[PDB]
Curated annotation (Swiss-Prot):
GO terms for molecular function: beta-N-acetylglucosaminidase activity; identical protein binding; lysozyme activity. One of its GO terms (cellular component) is cytoplasm. The gene is LYZ. The keyword Nucleotide-binding does not apply. Monomer. It comes from the Eukaryota. Substrate binds at residue 101. This is Lysozyme C. Lysozymes have primarily a bacteriolytic function; those in tissues and body fluids are associated with the monocyte-macrophage system and enhance the activity of immunoagents. Has bacteriolytic activity against M.luteus. SUPFAM superfamilies: Lysozyme-like. The active site is at residues 35, 52. Belongs to the glycosyl hydrolase 22 family. It comes from Gallus gallus (Chicken). The keyword Protease does not apply.
Amino acid sequence: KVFGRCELAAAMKRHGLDNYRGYSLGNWVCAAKFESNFNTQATNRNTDGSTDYGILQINSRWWCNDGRTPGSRNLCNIPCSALLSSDITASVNCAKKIVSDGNGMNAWVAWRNRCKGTDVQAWIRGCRL
Ligand SMILES: [Cl-]
Ligand SMILES: [Cl-]
């Protein structure tokens, strides 16, 4: 599923991400925009053999199990496939664990390079929330 902008904002707001660990909703929509272009089915292979999955591109090296990342962990205790669902609950719950691990949203390289320090509020402007 390819979300619309206001549509994803609303769903992320249904699931508790607005101001989670201090990050307003615009930060999370901005991050999804550049990680996946709002597509829950996005996947991308990393040079080390790990893979990023879903609308927030969560990595198999640490957070989910795909059966093909030697030496990895599965700290969210989920198969990576569950991160591709049109329902975003699994991605949201694992994101909450990631952003609380010490480095905040700097865990998402694309947030650091494309959202951090910008007018992220523009990503929710106009939306009925
Ligand atoms: Cl915002
Ligand atoms: Cl980047």
